[PDB]
From a paper:
SEN has been proposed to contribute to the virulence of GAS by serving as a plasmin(ogen) receptor. Although SEN has the ability to bind plasmin(ogen), it also catalyzes the conversion of 2-phosphoglycerate to phosphoenolpyruvate as part of the glycolytic pathway inside the cell. Alpha-enolases are typically homodimeric, however they have been found in some bacterial species including GAS to be octameric, consisting of a tetramer of dimers. Each subunit is made up of an N-terminal domain (residues 1–143) and a C-terminal domain (residues 144–435).
The crystal structures for SENK312A and SENK362A were determined at 2.15 Å and 2.10 Å resolution, respectively, and were consistent with the wild-type protein in terms of octameric structure and packing of secondary structural elements. There were, however, differences in the subunit interface area when compared to the wild-type protein, with the total buried surface area for SENK312A and SENK362A corresponding to 24,230 Å2 and 23,070 Å2, respectively (the corresponding value for wild-type SEN is 24,912 Å2). In our SENK312A structure, the L1 loop region shows two alternate conformations similar to the S. pneumoniae structure. K312, on the other hand, is located on the outer edge of the octameric ring and is not involved in oligomerization. This may be the reason why this mutant behaves more like the wild-type protein. Differential scanning fluorimetry (thermofluor) experiments showed that the thermostability of SENK312A was similar to the wild-type protein, with the melting point of SENK312A and wild-type SEN corresponding to 61.3°C and 60.6°C, respectively. By contrast, for wild-type SEN and SENK312A, only intact octamers could be detected. Surprisingly, two SEN mutants bound more plasminogen than the wild-type protein, with the percent increase in plasminogen binding for SENK312A and SENK362A corresponding to 196% and 341%, respectively. Interestingly, the activation rate of SENK362A (3.73 x 10-9 OD/s2) increased while SENK312A (1.237 x 10-9 OD/s2) decreased, to 1.75 and 0.58-fold, of the wild-type activity (2.123 x 10-9 OD/s2), respectively. Enzymatic activity was reduced by approximately 38% and 46% for SENK312A (81.2 nmol/min/μg) and SENK362A (71.21 nmol/min/μg), respectively.
Residue numbers in the entry: 0 to 435
């Protein structure tokens, strides 16, 4: 009776932006314990599982999570207490059924995920094994190649830049520990460069800069300078570059065009899907770009197909809002040859079970799974363990400042350290979707 869940308790806490979220605590009869904190996205995909907010404009601007917390304590708890802490799938399924809606809108995806994660961590604690081992079994070894959101554009930046994120990726590093150092050193060299230019070195939600660049090319060219300044190569043997275009954010839903004037000021390109592909292609041709996320709009299936046809053999194409970590959508992307990669955000779908189903479905189509943070993060580092548990090979968990990002990198350092000689780092070979 030691392994039986005796307590499931949620409380309201704050994410890395100072907005409410929640965490759940799970205890077994034996006293094994797990805590699950939930992240939150800024701009959420139209098709994401529902994150339940209170909507009370007198508390936290209506962003309270006390309703979700109540749901955990008064509904989910009664249903889950009594399960063996190790019956992850059964528990995730029970919560899905208990909610009864496809988008988890009754109990809230954040309520459900908090329990889902807390239960798993409690089970790992109960078995006295690392979380990546509990989740993945014995054959966990691959530290993920990180893509690091070093420069920001899009809505929040005031530079004339449409793309939300510009990342660097230490594909040439021998270990994760060294890749991490590479990234940090380039980050710090970038800061120095920005100061010398008289640009702002304060950071955005994910710990990167949003400097007033001349535009997209200036940003990318500035990153390459930082890379060289730090003493690294720009290419497959060193550090490569990637985008999160977040094109749904400037996709004119009515004109169904990609309106750059939105972020790059009037007189900027307005592109059709075709012209959108051409643009991305020009950039891939110009620079050492290894990956592009949401180059097309979450619902521009035709555009995705074309893009994947044109670039999918040269460049990784990651569906984020396109797939919302949902096997229903990924299964279709696969059938219709759209994208060759999926960004995995656990709170887009809401259970570890469904998250792991998405990761497995991806692998089996030859797609990479890039485990991701959200813009609103916590001190939790579960996605580091998910990345290694599944030997995913890649992770997107932020720039090299802010503990909401660094906590994941630190956890990956611990995991690499505990794995010792078994630890692997695939670098450029992470991209089995490009036959590397």
């Amino acid at each position: 009776h030691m392994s039986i869940i005796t307590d499931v308790y949620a409380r309201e806490v704050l994410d890395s932006r100072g907005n409410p979220t929640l965490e759940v605590e799970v205890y077994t009869e034996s006293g094994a314990f797990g805590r699950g904190m939930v992240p939150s996205g800024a701009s959420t995909g139209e098709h994401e599982a529902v994150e339940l907010r209170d909507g009370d404009k007198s508390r936290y601007l209506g962003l309270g999570t006390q309703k979700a917390v109540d749901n955990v304590n008064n509904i989910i708890a009664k249903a889950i207490i009594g399960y063996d802490v190790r019956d992850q799938q059964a528990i995730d399924r029970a919560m899905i059924a208990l909610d009864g809606t496809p988008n988890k809108g009754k109990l809230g995806a954040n309520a459900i995920l908090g329990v889902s994660i807390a239960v798993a961590r409690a089970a790992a604690d109960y078995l006295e094994v690392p979380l990546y081992t509990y989740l993945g079994g014995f054959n966990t070894k691959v530290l993920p190649t990180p893509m690091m959101n070093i420069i920001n554009g899009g809505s929040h930046s005031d530079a004339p830049i449409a793309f939300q994120e510009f990342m660097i990726m230490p594909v040439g590093a021998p270990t994760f520990k060294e890749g991490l150092r590479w990234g940090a050193e380039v980050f710090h060299a970038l800061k120095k460069i920005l100061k010398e230019r008289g640009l702002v070195t304060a950071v955005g939600d994910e710990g990167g800069f949003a400097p007033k660049f001349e535009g997209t090319e200036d940003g990318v060219e500035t990153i390459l300078k930082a890379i060289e300044a730090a003493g690294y190569e720009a290419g497959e043997n060193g550090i490569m570059i990637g985008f999160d275009c977040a094109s749904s954010e400037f996709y004119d839903k009515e004109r169904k065009v990609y309106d750059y004037t939105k972020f790059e000021g009037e007189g900027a390109a307005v592109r059709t899907s075709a012209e959108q592909v051409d643009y991305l292609e020009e950039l891939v041709n110009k620079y050492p770009i290894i990956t592009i996320e949401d180059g097309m709009d979450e619902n521009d299936w035709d555009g995705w197909k074309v893009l994947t046809e044109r670039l999918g053999a040269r460049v990784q194409l990651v569906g984020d809002d396109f797939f919302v970590t949902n096997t229903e959508y990924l299964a279709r992307g696969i059938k219709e040859n759209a994208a060759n990669s999926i960004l995995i955000k656990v709170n887009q779908i809401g259970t570890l079970t469904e998250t792991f189903e998405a990761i497995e479905m991806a692998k089996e189509a030859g797609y990479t799974a890039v485990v991701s943070h959200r813009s609103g993060e916590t001190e939790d580092s579960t996605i580091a363990d998910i990345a290694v548990a599944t030997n995913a090979g890649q992770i997107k968990t932020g720039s090299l400042s802010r503990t909401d990002r660094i906590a994941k990198y630190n956890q990956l350092l611990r995991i690499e350290d505990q794995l010792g000689e078994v630890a692997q780092y695939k670098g450029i070979k992470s991209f089995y979707n490009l036959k590397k």
